[PDB]
Symmetry: C5
Subunit: 98 residues, 5 copies
């Protein structure tokens, strides 16, 4: 099937949602942006630490950011404020045989 | 022929066009920008989910974004508002033999 | 000689120049910026399609963009407006033997 | 376990903290941003040289930057001003057997 | 020692300095930013051509840019104006045996 490696990923956030989600496939998030919304602060709690990964508002309607996770950790993605943001990314499954 | 891997890709959007297109070659989109136009909201419906990937306007005449798709999914690219945007990217066909 | 893979590339554009150039070495353009100039719209005609890859002006004196081409296509790079822009990039010659 | 290669990394800075830390795992920092804070200047002293890697303020509430370190050097990360910034990155452990 | 590949690199520029330097190790520059300074125009003369790679000022206190050089060329890095800028990057020594 040749090397695809990176397959499309997406995450639609609703105003003040918190998704504590485990990772079965390592992936990279590449952007978070709002179409409908006033303010969305994109927080990530991983390693039991609250990381502020992006602040995407009407003023900054799109935060293109380099995010990457591995299937070893269990992270929580949550947005504060009132806005609905769509994240985009790609699952990275790099294979080189053995 | 050596490793090219990433070959050039481009997509010219017209004001309020919706292209529901299948993927036979995995590719990365790297930028969406408008030359002629007032506003273009670049939406992507993949996995049956409306993702707002970029908002490119006269105010933000160019959104350089990290987009990547695989030949497994069937996505729809569509712009809202009135503007004509040109996306640019590269088809990633990484080969490492077997 | 070890793996260099990506070797330096550069392109100095003069106000309203059009270079229809073939590709013998696949390369990535990573930025277009103006030092002297008022406005430069960086267009790329490839696949016989006019792509607006960047709009770099005095207001936006530098457009860092992810561009990539392969030695299979023959593209034309041309800037509109009055400004002299310097593009920067790197030829990607990835080798992995056979 | 397949190729994960890049595993998630994060760094929460407090206003005017200096962490002189050794590297046992090579990693890339991809963003530094403030949620709470007025100003944070992100300095890095490596090779016994003070590098100003990013200036992230209330005005620029998020600096997405391409940082990369190797397990050979011993660096110091320190922020000046009053703000608490969260850095995000990923440890790059690329393996290709032998 | 596993694959480090990319090792940390940095370059502190003083107001109006010109470093004509040869490359013994291929590297990528990822950002140029000023902490102390009014204006720094980051020029690169390579292939005997003056490239304006970034314009980093008090207004634009940090230019995150994708720069890459190979150990084959001999380049000159020089900043104009009055400001002291710190560049950051990583030497890319990709090895895959033979």
């Amino acid at each position: 099937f040749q090397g695809a490696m990176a397959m499309f990923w997406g995450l639609n956030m609703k105003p003040e949602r918190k998704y504590s989600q485990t990772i079965i496939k390592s992936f990279h998030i590449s952007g978070v942006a709002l179409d409908k919304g006033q303010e969305a602060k994109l927080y990530l709690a991983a390693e039991k630490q609250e990381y502020i990964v992006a602040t995407v508002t009407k003023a900054i309607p799109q935060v293109a950011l380099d995010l990457n996770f591995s299937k070893g950790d269990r992270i929580m993605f949550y947005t504060a404020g009132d806005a609905s943001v769509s994240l985009l990314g790609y699952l990275h499954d790099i294979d080189s045989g053995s």
